[PDB]
Amino acid sequence: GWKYFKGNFYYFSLIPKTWYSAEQFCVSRNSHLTSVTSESEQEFLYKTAGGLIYWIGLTKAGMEGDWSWVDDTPFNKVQSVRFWIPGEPNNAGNNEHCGNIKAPSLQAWNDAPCDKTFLFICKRPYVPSEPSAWS
């Protein structure tokens, strides 16, 4: 059930999980909750989501509380400003440390409590099967 888009496969779950249980599901499938690194990718994701809320790999790290991607793609603050829902992230109740895709629009992300259960999106790169590149 993996959908393909620009060198990566994506899994849109049918079962809701907490953010971390979702990530552990993705890891069990050789993947991670999805990063988003371009306008086209954001579009593909929100359109495929179709108005339902999905956990993505957005999560807080480091002492300052900076947003980051669980797949370890460096988080580009500047290029991601357009991807949040207006007025987010707002840290409602000071307990919103994970992020989801929410609105069906380029401005789509909300921060939400990590312990809430949502559907979720996994992402894994296509890696072709080739012999050892060492020698």
Ligand X SMILES: OC[C@H]1O[C@H](O[C@H]2[C@H](O)[C@@H](O)[C@@H](O)O[C@@H]2CO)[C@H](O)[C@@H](O)[C@@H]1O
41 binds Ca ion (CB under 5 A): no
Which of the stretches 2-10, 13-21, 87-95, 116-124 binds Ca ion when contact is defined by CB under 5 A?
87-95
Nearest position to Ca ion, beta carbon: 111
Within 8 A by CB and 6+ apart from 25, the residues are: 13, 17, 120, 122
41 contact, one of Ca ion, ligand X, none, CB 5-8 Å limit per kind = none
Q: How far apart are the first and last CA of the chain?
A: 36
- Dihedral of the CA atoms 108, 111, 117, 118 (nearest 10)? 10
Which of the stretches 16-24, 41-49, 54-62, 94-102 binds Ca ion when contact is defined by CB under 5 A?
94-102
Which candidate, 78, 76, 77, 84, places its Cα nearest to that of 100? 84
Per-residue contact string for residues 72-111; x = within reach of ligand X by CB under 6 A: ----------------x-x-x---x-------------x-
